[PDB]
């Protein structure tokens, strides 16, 4: 169905997207972050004939020339981590600049984050694509995770602006906690946090209401937006909003083998109640989510058990 260039190939999301692309008939070009061993990628079905690796540096557009040559799509899932701002903007724009005047790329999809919309200074429990985090507020108030939030906010804004000024069909996906099975060598942070009730202790509880999405639905959304000419722009991809209390009820019933804090034990639990990132825009565009909240937790749990994290 064509060749797609995926950055951050060895990362949790990037590697899953490569797996998905290969399963769906696409060929894949990928750039990765140095740490050695990409066996978990080269062993993926179809990789020995359709997966190709390329050296590149996020800040040098020309270093991406070969990697995007002949590609129908570019999925930019990688990030670098006045000087910090430069590294952030340069890393987000590097491969996008390389895409200028491409004779084949039909869609450039940038991976964003809920951190780019959740720190807006207002107490709104439901957000949409018009909402943005306040960088000035983040830098002055400095809430937990402000550095990452500033990075994501500035990067997404730069991508949208550059795309508009250079006629590139850009789509950005605002992603919440991404959870599911994984093929990468380390336990993804988002999964470790999402499984706090079965993997961690009460002392590790921070977030008490999670916006979430199944990793395979994220891969499916990328392919959908690449194949369907719906409007470019921002799209929340966050079908679930899960209070930790509901999380407890679900996990306690489905996994009685684990010692899980009960709703009663969670009473008056203090923490961050994240906003629901309304995903109506993406659904209105025709995309259909395939997985349920139960599927998401089960895939993550079974994968963790298989790999020794549970």
Curated annotation (Swiss-Prot):
Activity-pH behavior: Optimum pH is 6.0.
Molecular function GO terms recorded: (3R)-2'-hydroxyisoflavanone reductase activity
* Domain of life assignment: Eukaryota
Which key words are in the record? Flavonoid biosynthesis, NADP, Oxidoreductase, Plant defense
Look up the EC number in the record and give it: 1.1.1.348
Report which reactions are catalysed by this protein: a (3R,4R)-4,2'-dihydroxyisoflavan + NADP(+) = a (3R)-2'-hydroxyisoflavanone + NADPH + H(+)
Binding-site residues for NADP(+), renumbered to this chain? 8-14, 33, 148
Thermal dependence of catalysis: Optimum temperature is 30 degrees Celsius.
Summarize induction of expression: Transiently up-regulated by fungal elicitors, peaking 6 hours after elicitor treatment.
What is one GO biological process annotated to this record? defense response
Quote any Pfam family the record assigns.
Answer: Epimerase
Per UniProt, activity regulation is: Inhibited by vestitone concentrations above 50 uM.
Chain segments annotated as coiled-coil in the UniProt record: none
Q: In which tissues is it expressed?
A: Detected in roots, and at lower levels in root nodules. Not detected in petioles, leaf and stem.
Quaternary structure and partners: Monomer.
* PANTHER family per record: DIHYDROFLAVONOL 4-REDUCTASE-LIKE PROTEIN (PTHR10366:SF617), NAD DEPENDENT EPIMERASE/DEHYDRATASE (PTHR10366)
This molecule's function is given as:
Stereospecific enzyme that catalyzes the NADPH-dependent reduction of (3R)-vestitone to (3R,4R)-4'-methoxyisoflavan-2',4,7-triol (DMI). Has no activity with (3S)-vestitone. Catalyzes the penultimate step in the biosynthesis of the phytoalexin medicarpin, and thereby contributes to plant defense reactions.
Family, per entry? Belongs to the NAD(P)-dependent epimerase/dehydratase family. Dihydroflavonol-4-reductase subfamily.
Kindly provide the name given to this protein in its UniProt entry: Vestitone reductase
Native species of this protein? Answer: Medicago sativa
């Amino acid at each position: 169905k064509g060749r797609v260039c995926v950055t951050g190939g060895t990362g949790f999301l990037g590697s899953w997207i490569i797996k998905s692309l290969l399963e769906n008939g696409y060929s894949v070009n990928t750039t990765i972050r140095a740490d050695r061993d990409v066996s978990f990628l080269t062993n993926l079905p179809g990789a020995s004939e359709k997966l190709h690796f390329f050296n590149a540096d996020l800040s040098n557009p020309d270093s991406f020339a070969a990697a995007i040559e002949g590609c129908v799509g570019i999925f930019h899932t990688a990030s670098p981590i006045e000087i910090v701002t430069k590294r952030t903007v340069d890393g987000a724009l590097g491969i996008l600049k390389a895409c200028v005047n491409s004779k084949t790329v039909k869609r450039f999809i940038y991976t964003s984050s809920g951190s780019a919309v959740s720190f807006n200074g207002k107490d709104k429990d439901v957000l949409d694509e018009s909402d943005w985090s306040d960088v000035d507020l983040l830098r002055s108030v400095k809430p937990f995770g402000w550095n990452y939030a500033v990075s994501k906010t500035l990067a997404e804004k730069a991508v949208l602006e550059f795309g508009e000024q250079n006629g590139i069909d850009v789509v950005t996906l605002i992603l919440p906690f991404i959870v599911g099975r994984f093929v990468c060598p380390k336990l993804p942070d988002s999964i470790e946090k999402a499984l706090v009730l079965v993997l961690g202790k009460k002392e590790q509880i921070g977030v008490t209401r999670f916006h979430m999405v199944h990793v395979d639905d994220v891969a499916r959304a990328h392919i959908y937006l690449l194949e369907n000419s719906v409007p470019g722009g921002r799209y929340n991809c966050s079908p679930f909003i899960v209070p930790i209390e509901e999380m407890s009820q679900l996990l306690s019933a489905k996994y009685p083998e684990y010692q899980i804090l009960t709703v009663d034990e969670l009473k008056e639990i203090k923490g961050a109640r994240l906003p629901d990132l309304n995903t109506k825009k993406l659904v209105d565009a025709g995309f259909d989510f395939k997985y349920t909240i139960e599927d998401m937790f089960d895939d993550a749990i079974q994968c963790c058990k298989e790999k020794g994290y549970l």
